[PDB]
């Protein structure tokens, strides 16, 4: 499903992304915005046999198993299909594991270019939460 901005913000807060390892809610909202426009069903095929799945476009080359990707490391130990759910539980958990690496949110190129070092709080300002 496609979330409303504030709706996703509240959901992400419920799922404990606000201030997770230092990253304020805004960062994740902004990231979701540029990666999939808040669409849980968003997918993107790459030149290799990998696809980006979910609201945070998590790549199947390293993070999930789609049962048909050459070199599946399945870092998140999860079926890529879980990342397309209307329930964001799986996408958040995997994002938390990804961000637990040293590079933090830099794993998301879109976040670096469009959110890193900005007034990210703007992405949640106005929302009733």
């Amino acid at each position: 499903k496609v979330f409303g901005r504030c709706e996703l913000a509240a959901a992400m807060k419920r799922h404990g992304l606000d201030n997770y390892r230092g990253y304020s809610l805004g960062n994740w909202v902004c990231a979701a915005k540029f990666e999939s426009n808040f669409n849980t069903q968003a997918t993107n095929r790459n030149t290799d046999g990998s696809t980006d799945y979910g609201i945070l476009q998590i790549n199947s080359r390293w993070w999930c198993n789609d049962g048909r990707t050459p070199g599946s490391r399945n870092l998140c130990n999860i079926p890529c299909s879980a990342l397309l759910s209307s329930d964001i539980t799986a996408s958040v958990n995997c994002a938390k594991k990804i961000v637990s690496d040293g590079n933090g949110m830099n794993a998301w190129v879109a976040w670096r270019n469009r959110c890193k070092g900005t007034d990210v709080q703007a992405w949640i300002r106005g929302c009733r939460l």
Partner: antibody
Amino acid sequence: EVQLQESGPSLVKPSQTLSLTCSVTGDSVTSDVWSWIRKFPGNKLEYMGYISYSGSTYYHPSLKSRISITRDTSKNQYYLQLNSVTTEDTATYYCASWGGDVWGAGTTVTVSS
Amino acid sequence: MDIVLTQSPATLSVTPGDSVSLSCRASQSISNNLHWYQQKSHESPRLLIKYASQSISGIPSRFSGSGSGTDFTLSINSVETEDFGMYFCQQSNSWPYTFGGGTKLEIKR
């Protein structure tokens, strides 16, 4: 099924170095984030640190200085190194997945002269 | 700065069949980033609930977790004979990760 197993010297002398090995079976060491957790007497647990899929690491600040976590991709093991130990480092040591789903049986390391 | 987790009661004595609730409080808000572990004598810790209330496929249904922020609760609907031992909470919201002092679940007689 993924399984872990700790191994190493059960006795370390003060000022010396404590070394432990965690053998990963069932999956690849490069395919997950792995940790070292120690349990002091009196049920006091301390999350020592973890090494990610890339090889990057995070160490507990109180330990930062004496700790080192590494891995060996061909052997499928990751290690713990703790320098200048003192009787205070006597504890039961466990290796576990970052996700917390798999834990080794744990091994006791005693620091004494 | 390091987040401190306080668990209570330190010890709890119950009869198999009774239900119980264990508390874990954080010195700083941690949202849902609180995990519950069980460790019985001579055994390694076992993850029971992750992220405050998410269940783990394979963990008995009598175990459940609730709470958010700084107050969390592990509930056991009708404790069973194999459920006695230590219970610890751990937060993964900020590094370093930290554990509460644990609560001992013991047999009432």
